[PDB]
């Protein structure tokens, strides 16, 4: 099944900057997120369809995660990617899609919509703790990008 969850967020950063920075995620992520060590393109040019291998550490152990870039829609400052392999897909999970869409906020910032689509195998539902973890990672990635823009204002 597919189970969809939407959360509304804010940023003091304007949306075109966050959008441009979201596209440098491969460079930003290992800098800001301690446990992300590398991001390598397996296939593709960085746009939709691109497969990426992420090397992370969990408890001193190296683990590998696979991401796919799904779609980008610059018109709506929208960037979608999915987790397609590794530890975040327990046996009853097929894939998890993380969508981000941004609009201008009331004071030079942004209003964001973070959508999590949790794809299960057959009849299964998302485990509640797995959904919690997934939402945390998706928002954490958004906050890594935002934090990088806040710390490096001349770059966007």
Ligand X SMILES: O=S(=O)(O)c1cccc2cccc(Nc3ccccc3)c12
Residue pair 76/87 in contact (Cβ under 8 Å)? The answer is no
Whole-angstrom CA distances from 118 to 22, 39, 45, 111, 130 are 21, 23, 26, 23, 10
> Are 52 and 40 within 8 A, CB to CB?
yes
**Helix, strand or coil, per DSSP, at residue 104:** strand
Say which residues have a Cβ less than 8 Å from residue 61's Cβ, sequence separation at least 6. Answer: none
Region for residue 46 given its phi and psi (left: phi exceeds 0; alpha: psi -120 to 50; beta: otherwise):
left
> Binding to ligand X by residue 22, rule CB under 6 A?
no
Q: According to the binding rule CB under 6 A, does residue 118 interact with ligand X? A: no
Residue 2 or 57 with smaller CB distance to its own copies: 57
Q: Is 54 in the site for ligand X (CB under 6 A)?
A: yes
Using CB under 6 A as the binding rule, whether residue 77 contacts ligand X is answered as no
* 41 belongs to the binding site for ligand X (CB under 6 A): no
Contact status: 35 vs ligand X (CB under 6 A): yes
Task: Using CB under 5 A, list all residues that contact Na ion.
Answer: 30, 34, 36
In this chain, which stretch among 44-52, 72-80, 107-115, 148-156 interacts with its own copies, using CB under 8 A?
148-156
Rule CB under 8 A: is residue 87 a binding residue for its own copies? no
Question: Please, what is the minimum distance in Å from the beta carbon of residue 143 to ligand X?
Answer: 8
d(CA 110, CA 21): 14
- Residues lying near its own copies in the complex (CB under 8 A) are found at 12, 31-35, 136, 139-141, 143-144, 146-148, 150-155
């Amino acid at each position: 099944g597919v189970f969809t969850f939407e959360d509304e967020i804010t940023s003091t950063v304007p949306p075109a900057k966050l959008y441009n920075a979201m596209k440098d995620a491969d460079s930003i992520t290992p800098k800001i997120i301690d446990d992300v060590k590398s991001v390598e393109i397996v296939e593709g040019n960085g746009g939709p369809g691109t497969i990426k291998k992420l090397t992370i550490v969990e408890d001193g152990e190296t683990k590998f995660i696979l991401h796919k870039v799904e779609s980008i829609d610059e018109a709506n400052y929208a960037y979608n990617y999915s987790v397609v392999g590794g530890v975040a897909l327990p046996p009853t999970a097929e894939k998890i899609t993380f969508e981000t869409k941004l609009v201008e906020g009331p004071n030079g910032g942004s209003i964001g919509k973070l959508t999590l689509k949790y794809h299960t195998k057959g009849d299964a539902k998302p485990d509640e703790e797995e959904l919690k973890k997934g939402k945390a990672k998706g928002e954490g990635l958004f906050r890594a990008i935002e934090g990088y823009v806040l710390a490096n204002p001349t770059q966007y």
